[PDB]
Amino acid sequence: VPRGSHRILNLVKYDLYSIFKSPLTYLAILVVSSLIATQSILMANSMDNPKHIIVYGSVFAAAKWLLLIIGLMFVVKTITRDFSQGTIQLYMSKVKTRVGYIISKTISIILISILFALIHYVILIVVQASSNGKNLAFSKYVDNLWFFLIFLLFFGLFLFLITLASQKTAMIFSLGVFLVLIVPFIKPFITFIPRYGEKVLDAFDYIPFAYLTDKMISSNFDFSNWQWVISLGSIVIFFILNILYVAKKDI
Amino acid sequence: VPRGSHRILNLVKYDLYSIFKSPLTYLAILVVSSLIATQSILMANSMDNPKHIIVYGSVFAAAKWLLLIIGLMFVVKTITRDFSQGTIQLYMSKVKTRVGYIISKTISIILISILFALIHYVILIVVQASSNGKNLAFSKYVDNLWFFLIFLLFFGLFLFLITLASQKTAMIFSLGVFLVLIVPFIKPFITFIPRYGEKVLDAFDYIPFAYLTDKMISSNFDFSNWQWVISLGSIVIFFILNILYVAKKDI
Amino acid sequence: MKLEHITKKYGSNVVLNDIDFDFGDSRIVGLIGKNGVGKTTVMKVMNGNIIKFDGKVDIDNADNIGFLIEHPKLYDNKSGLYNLKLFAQVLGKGFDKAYTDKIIDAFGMRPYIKKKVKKYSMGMKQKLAIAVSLMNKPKFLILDEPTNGMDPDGSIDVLTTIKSLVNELDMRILISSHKLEDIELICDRAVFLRDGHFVQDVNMSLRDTYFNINQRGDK
Amino acid sequence: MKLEHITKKYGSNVVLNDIDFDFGDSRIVGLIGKNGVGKTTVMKVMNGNIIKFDGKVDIDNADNIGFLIEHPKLYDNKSGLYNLKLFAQVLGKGFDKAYTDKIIDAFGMRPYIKKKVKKYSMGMKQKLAIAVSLMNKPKFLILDEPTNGMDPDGSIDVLTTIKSLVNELDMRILISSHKLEDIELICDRAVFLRDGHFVQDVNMSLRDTYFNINQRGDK
Ligand SMILES: Nc1ncnc2c1ncn2[C@@H]1O[C@H](COP(=O)(O)OP(=O)(O)OP(O)(O)=S)[C@@H](O)[C@H]1O
Ligand SMILES: Nc1ncnc2c1ncn2[C@@H]1O[C@H](COP(=O)(O)OP(=O)(O)OP(O)(O)=S)[C@@H](O)[C@H]1O
Ligand SMILES: [Mg+2]
Ligand SMILES: [Mg+2]
């Protein structure tokens, strides 16, 4: 009934509300804005002594990288808040509520992703207003939203399941960071070394951790039919597992 | 008096004791061993169809990377254990004890670093026993110890100070990982882009975070006189700050 | 809220063993026993924080259950008032300002309700936690040592307030608690739990009853 | 252990105000007051967990102080026995097996001492925590509601045990606690704290004394 739905949404509202009140959020936004403005101002308009013309695509990709990381950390905090304060015990009292808890968090993750995508959009629009160059297609920004939604929801639900499996929070933040910064590190470090190097590299296109992390610094994207399906399928199964698990795990 | 020293050491003994009992330690060791054996077996002895002759230096550097990360996480756990369980409140009751607490942890960090260096040594000796190639100098392994001691102590004390400053543990594990995997990521991503690119890159030689992280994947090292001094000086000041801070911070 | 044949063990340690429970038209049921007997365990089964109890827990899920188990659960960086509003909106039906105020002033937590929880004393946290549970305007209230950290006056006012509320709302209250003297203030029965099962059903000192039953464990 | 002119505030909230304290050749001093008065604060100042108290805390640092403040502090993934050994070696002089055993069996925690702390009940954790403090073989023992979660028998045996120990060891004990009835079992004086200062020094019910002093805050 709508009463159930209402209670679920009320929890969502509080998590988002918190994001918009903590000064930390505001700080993080200012940091991103500063870094982007810095790149634009310092060299995009000056390195080759151009007549102040820049590549928004370079800015775009950098902004995405930063916001996806900050976003993922916001997602992790959203996920771990109840384990941290121990308040989870007050929610998981019956199946209807336990399931609603997962639903609420899933919704919050989606809304966080939307927020970050909106920030990304705004930062880049300001850059476009500020200098010269051909503006990016609206549809490019839209596809960027899709990337954010998928990236963050995939990692969010994955980490959520782990959080519930272990009931630890320190290692969730650790994994969020670790996974993001390991793919781009390890690829060029050793992928080329084994006789299976090419095999391994090709394999990454079918592994969401690898391809979603790699695309975090791309100016654009185009998922292959398989790659698209695999990522979305992974999201669906994690969601399902979270439900099946929460329904059985003692708190 | 020796009684004071004894109590400090007893705390150290317990932290190390814990490391040697948890199955997680044993798992981590096996993982490193497996990865090294894997590289040796899969391609070092076969990629170019050599007569089973390998470069221990490639193995050496990889092993170092893995052990320094695992080591740093062991260090972070050693640091945050008392905040996590809240047991810190039972120690910080008077200055003599508060100071002893810092001393104990400093000693534990050093001993952890030694342990990891010993593991590194053993893994590589096994590799040398296993296949062909010119064995690495004993003195190279020794210098590698020095690298471990410095790397881990620098990060350990830095993170310790943060831990005490914020009284949070989730963000200590996060920083440990983040810092390690960010330097090698960011360098080639944007260092070359600004007109100050060369300036920035050169600057990294004087910034311990950058140069200590970068050398984690080197087969060897040679610190410049400045670089050597800067790192060691940084360790000393962190140690001092930890003492001054713990002596004043309410628990 | 009925329990039929509940059995629960941790490995070889049987805590509950074929234990039955109900409210025989009673409203306030006290639960008495020694530490290690399983009072919290029973409450968790009723709350539904356990799903491995090998038995039947009969709950009309249409109803709300409010509860407080072990140490209080609060969001530390938020105000007391914030927590009450949140839980009322989240676990409860909605935030009822008048209801909330009656509890705050009855408990006398008013002077610090707008301060952050991390700045609260243990006692203050418990007064708030009880209120948090009450904010669901539940029918079943399950409290694990609700006055454990309260001072003499706090305990009396809180317990008195709850008794008033069980008529305002059609409630059934289960209170597991030491301080038999507090149970004696607000009760109409008490059950004595020992060795995984109920031993006495005492309809209405409780202290004398308790010792008669449990003193021989250690003595 | 003397306190001279201790003053402590949190922002505008003055908790302690020119408060003095000593042991006038007494051994067991109870501390009584309402929740929010500052009993824990006083104890933290004495323990030395606070260094911003604007006053003089006179402690011969040659001596050991054992203590338990708020919820028990234990290493959760280790056994009870492990914690006792650790603290005896770490904060205490060394691990005294005979001493340890007397406490374990006197408290009656023996049946679960080898089990992991995370598997302990709240009551069990407190019995252990008291023992942990005692393991330092301290001279000054400071306990914040030491029997807060104990059952009727646990409380009596633990308190009795401590009183025996204050003669075995030359101890001075400060106990902040509700359950005036427990203070009345083991005490030779009690002090009543109100509005940041001591109001009565009662040398030796305490409940009647308490209400006479504090009831007017709320009533
Ligand atoms: N997570 C757990 N793992 C193992 N044993 C447990 C766990 N939780 C509780 N127990 C055991 O179950 C028994 C009863 O536990 P509780 O329900 O917490 O006790 P209780 O009746 O609430 O007692 P209190 O805490 O002193 S009021 C004890 O023997 C505990 O050691
Ligand atoms: N960290 C803190 N920040 C702000 N205020 C605090 C803090 N800790 C305690 N207080 C306040 O200090 C006053 C006394 O606190 P306590 O020493 O914890 O009380 P108490 O006498 O031990 O009471 P209990 O917990 O109910 S026995 C209260 O008004 C608290 O709100
Ligand atoms: Mg309990
Ligand atoms: Mg207190």
PDB file of C-alpha atoms and ligand atoms in Angstrom, chain C residues 10-11 13-15 31 33-44 70 144-145 176-178 193, chain D residues 112 115-116 118-124 149-151, ligand 1:
ATOM      1  CA  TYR C  10      24.102 -20.508  19.648  1.00  0.00           C
ATOM      2  CA  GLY C  11      26.071 -23.530  18.626  1.00  0.00           C
ATOM      3  CA  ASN C  13      24.390 -23.145  23.885  1.00  0.00           C
ATOM      4  CA  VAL C  14      20.667 -23.452  24.136  1.00  0.00           C
ATOM      5  CA  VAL C  15      19.170 -20.212  25.255  1.00  0.00           C
ATOM      6  CA  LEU C  31      10.405 -10.145  32.512  1.00  0.00           C
ATOM      7  CA  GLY C  33      15.783 -13.475  35.201  1.00  0.00           C
ATOM      8  CA  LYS C  34      19.549 -13.630  35.755  1.00  0.00           C
ATOM      9  CA  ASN C  35      22.132 -12.307  33.400  1.00  0.00           C
ATOM     10  CA  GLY C  36      22.795 -14.953  30.771  1.00  0.00           C
ATOM     11  CA  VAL C  37      19.279 -16.382  30.787  1.00  0.00           C
ATOM     12  CA  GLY C  38      18.148 -14.862  27.492  1.00  0.00           C
ATOM     13  CA  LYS C  39      15.784 -11.949  28.150  1.00  0.00           C
ATOM     14  CA  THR C  40      17.230  -9.929  25.224  1.00  0.00           C
ATOM     15  CA  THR C  41      17.042 -12.995  23.000  1.00  0.00           C
ATOM     16  CA  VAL C  42      13.351 -13.357  23.668  1.00  0.00           C
ATOM     17  CA  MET C  43      12.775  -9.746  22.866  1.00  0.00           C
ATOM     18  CA  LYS C  44      14.788  -9.916  19.665  1.00  0.00           C
ATOM     19  CA  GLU C  70      20.809  -3.121  24.754  1.00  0.00           C
ATOM     20  CA  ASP C 144      15.294  -4.042  27.307  1.00  0.00           C
ATOM     21  CA  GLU C 145      16.143  -2.536  30.691  1.00  0.00           C
ATOM     22  CA  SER C 176      12.758  -6.877  30.784  1.00  0.00           C
ATOM     23  CA  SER C 177      14.421  -5.377  33.712  1.00  0.00           C
ATOM     24  CA  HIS C 178      16.539  -5.456  36.801  1.00  0.00           C
ATOM     25  CA  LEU C 193      12.693 -16.981  33.023  1.00  0.00           C
TER      26      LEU C 193
ATOM     27  CA  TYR D 112      32.038 -17.806  29.805  1.00  0.00           C
ATOM     28  CA  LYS D 115      34.297 -17.139  25.099  1.00  0.00           C
ATOM     29  CA  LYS D 116      34.694 -14.162  22.784  1.00  0.00           C
ATOM     30  CA  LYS D 118      31.248 -10.117  21.182  1.00  0.00           C
ATOM     31  CA  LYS D 119      29.184 -13.138  22.338  1.00  0.00           C
ATOM     32  CA  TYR D 120      28.747 -11.609  25.798  1.00  0.00           C
ATOM     33  CA  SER D 121      25.621 -10.044  27.125  1.00  0.00           C
ATOM     34  CA  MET D 122      25.648  -6.480  28.452  1.00  0.00           C
ATOM     35  CA  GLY D 123      25.719  -7.795  32.008  1.00  0.00           C
ATOM     36  CA  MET D 124      28.602 -10.118  31.280  1.00  0.00           C
ATOM     37  CA  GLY D 149      23.578  -3.725  34.109  1.00  0.00           C
ATOM     38  CA  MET D 150      24.109  -6.320  36.825  1.00  0.00           C
ATOM     39  CA  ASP D 151      21.467  -8.583  38.215  1.00  0.00           C
TER      40      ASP D 151
HETATM   41  N1  LIG E   1      25.871 -13.032  19.376  1.00  0.00           N
HETATM   42  C1  LIG E   1      25.941 -14.002  20.292  1.00  0.00           C
HETATM   43  N2  LIG E   1      26.777 -15.042  20.067  1.00  0.00           N
HETATM   44  C2  LIG E   1      26.845 -16.021  20.978  1.00  0.00           C
HETATM   45  N3  LIG E   1      26.179 -16.139  22.132  1.00  0.00           N
HETATM   46  C3  LIG E   1      25.366 -15.095  22.330  1.00  0.00           C
HETATM   47  C4  LIG E   1      25.187 -14.009  21.483  1.00  0.00           C
HETATM   48  N4  LIG E   1      24.267 -13.118  22.014  1.00  0.00           N
HETATM   49  C5  LIG E   1      23.921 -13.671  23.152  1.00  0.00           C
HETATM   50  N5  LIG E   1      24.546 -14.864  23.410  1.00  0.00           N
HETATM   51  C6  LIG E   1      24.399 -15.707  24.596  1.00  0.00           C
HETATM   52  O1  LIG E   1      23.018 -15.914  24.824  1.00  0.00           O
HETATM   53  C7  LIG E   1      22.739 -15.940  26.240  1.00  0.00           C
HETATM   54  C8  LIG E   1      21.617 -14.985  26.560  1.00  0.00           C
HETATM   55  O2  LIG E   1      21.927 -13.694  25.998  1.00  0.00           O
HETATM   56  P1  LIG E   1      21.001 -12.407  26.200  1.00  0.00           P
HETATM   57  O3  LIG E   1      19.694 -12.541  25.526  1.00  0.00           O
HETATM   58  O4  LIG E   1      21.810 -11.181  25.771  1.00  0.00           O
HETATM   59  O5  LIG E   1      20.822 -12.328  27.776  1.00  0.00           O
HETATM   60  P2  LIG E   1      19.821 -11.529  28.716  1.00  0.00           P
HETATM   61  O6  LIG E   1      18.790 -12.414  29.301  1.00  0.00           O
HETATM   62  O7  LIG E   1      19.309 -10.330  27.920  1.00  0.00           O
HETATM   63  O8  LIG E   1      20.820 -10.976  29.820  1.00  0.00           O
HETATM   64  P3  LIG E   1      21.190  -9.517  30.212  1.00  0.00           P
HETATM   65  O9  LIG E   1      22.029  -8.952  29.015  1.00  0.00           O
HETATM   66  O10 LIG E   1      22.320  -9.611  31.260  1.00  0.00           O
HETATM   67  S1  LIG E   1      19.580  -8.583  30.595  1.00  0.00           S
HETATM   68  C9  LIG E   1      24.069 -15.704  26.962  1.00  0.00           C
HETATM   69  O11 LIG E   1      24.574 -16.912  27.521  1.00  0.00           O
HETATM   70  C10 LIG E   1      24.970 -15.097  25.876  1.00  0.00           C
HETATM   71  O12 LIG E   1      26.338 -15.467  26.022  1.00  0.00           O
END
